Amino acid sequence: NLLPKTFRTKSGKEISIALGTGTKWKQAQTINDVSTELVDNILLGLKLGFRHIDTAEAYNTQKEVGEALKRTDVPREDIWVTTKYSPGWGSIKAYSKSPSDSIDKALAQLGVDYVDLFLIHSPFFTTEQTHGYTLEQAWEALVEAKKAGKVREIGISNAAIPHLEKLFAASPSPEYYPVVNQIEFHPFLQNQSKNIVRFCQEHGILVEAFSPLAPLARVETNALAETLKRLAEKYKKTEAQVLLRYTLQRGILPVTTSSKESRLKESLNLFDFELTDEEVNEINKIGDANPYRAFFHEQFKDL
Numbered sequence: 001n002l003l004p005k006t007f008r009t010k011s012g013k014e015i016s017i018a019l020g021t022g023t024k025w026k027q028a029q030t031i032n033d034v035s036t037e038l039v040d041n042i043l044l045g046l047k048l049g050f051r052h053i054d055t056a057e058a059y060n061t062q063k064e065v066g067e068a069l070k071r072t073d074v075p076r077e078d079i080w081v082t083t084k085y086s087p088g089w090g091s092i093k094a095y096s097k098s099p100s101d102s103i104d105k106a107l108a109q110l111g112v113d114y115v116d117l118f119l120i121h122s123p124f125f126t127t128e129q130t131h132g133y134t135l136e137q138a139w140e141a142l143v144e145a146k147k148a149g150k151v152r153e154i155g156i157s158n159a160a161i162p163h164l165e166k167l168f169a170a171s172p173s174p175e176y177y178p179v180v181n182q183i184e185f186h187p188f189l190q191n192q193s194k195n196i197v198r199f200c201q202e203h204g205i206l207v208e209a210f211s212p213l214a215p216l217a218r219v220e221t222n223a224l225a226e227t228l229k230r231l232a233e234k235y236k237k238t239e240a241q242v243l244l245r246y247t248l249q250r251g252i253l254p255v256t257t258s259s260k261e262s263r264l265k266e267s268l269n270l271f272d273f274e275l276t277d278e279e280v281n282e283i284n285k286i287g288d289a290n291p292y293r294a295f296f297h298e299q300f301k302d303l
C-alpha cells in the first residue's frame with residue numbers, strides 16, 4: 001500500500017527497499033579484485049530479507065553483486081537488480097565505449113541473463129564524456145535493450161523535469177517511457193529539482209530516494225533530531241526506521257546502505273508501524289525549513 005507505482009521480481013515478488021552498493025562501497029574501476037567485505041555485506045542483506053540491490057557501472061561493484069548472486073541461496077528470480085550506465089563526472093569519462101556496451105558489460109559482470117532495472121546514471125554529461133552519445137542516444141540503447149529482454153524496466157537517475165521530457169520525446173511509444181527516477185530525497189531535500197516528486201508520480205514514474213538517512217548520516221546538525229527521537233520513542237523504532245517509513249509513506253522507494261548487521265535488519269522492519277499524516281507533515285515542514293543537499297550542487301543550481 002505504500003508505492004503509487006511499483007514492480008515485481010521475475011518470480012513475482014514485491015520490489016523491496018534497495019541495498020546500496022555505491023557511496024562508501026564504491027571502487028576504482030580498474031580493480032578486478034572482489035571485495036570480500038562487500039560480497040559478505042550483500043549476502044548478509046539478502047539473508048536478512050533485502051530483495052533489491054542497487055549498484056552502478058561507476059561503483060565498480062557489479063562484480064561483487066555478481067559473486068553474491070552466485071553464492072546466495074535466494075533464487076535470482078526472487079531478487080530485483082538495479083544498475084546504471086555511468087556517463088562520467090568532472091574529470092572522469094564514461095567507462096564504457098557506448099551505452100549499449102555498458103548494458104552488455106553489466107550482464108557479464110553481474111552474471112545474469114537480464115537486469116530488472118537499468119537507469120541512465122545522470123543526465124549531466126557531454127558526448128565527450130560518453131565517447132559520442134547524447135541523452136536521446138543513450139535512451140535509444142536502453143529502449144533496444146528492453147525490446148531485446150536484456151532489461152525488464154528502464155529509467156533514469158538525477159533527472160529534472162526537462163530531462164524527463166526529453167526522454168518521453170525520444171521514446172517510440174508510451175511503453176518505452178522512463179518508469180523510475182532515482183533522486184536524492186530526504187526531509188531536507190524533498191524535491192531534488194523543481195516539483196520533481198509530484199511530476200514523476202503524476203506521470204507513472206516511481207521515485208526512488210538515495211541518501212534517505214542524510215539527517216542522521218550526513219549533516220552536522222540535524223534539525224529533525226527531537227522530532228525523530230519522539231517518534232522513535234513512540235513507535236519503539238529507531239530514528240533511521242522512522243525516516244525510511246516516512247520516505248515510503250511519501251510513495252518513494254528508499255535506497256539505503258549500512259555495513260552493520262543490526263542496521264540492515266532494522267532497515268527492513270518497517271511494516272509493523274505507520275506514521276500519522278500529521279507526523280509525516282511535521283517531518284515535511286521542519287525538513288523544508290532546513291534545506292540540505294548532499295550531491296550535485298552545481299548541476300541543480302538552476303533547476
Ligand SMILES: NC(=O)C1=CN([C@@H]2O[C@H](COP(=O)(O)OP(=O)(O)OC[C@H]3O[C@@H](n4cnc5c(N)ncnc54)[C@H](OP(=O)(O)O)[C@@H]3O)[C@@H](O)[C@H]2O)C=CC1
Nearest residue numbers: 020021022023157210211212213216217240256257258259
Ligand atoms: N543515483 C545516484 O547518483 C546515487 C545513488 N546512490 C545509491 O544509494 C546508496 C545509498 O546512498 P547513501 O547516501 O549511502 O544512503 P543512506 O542515506 O542510507 O546512508 C548511508 C550511511 O548511513 C549510515 N546509517 C545507517 N543507519 C544509521 C543510523 N541508524 N544512525 C546513523 N547513521 C546510520 C550508515 O553507516 P553504517 O554503515 O555505519 O550503518 C551509512 O554510512 C548508495 O550506496 C548508492 O547505491 C547514492 C548516491 C547517489
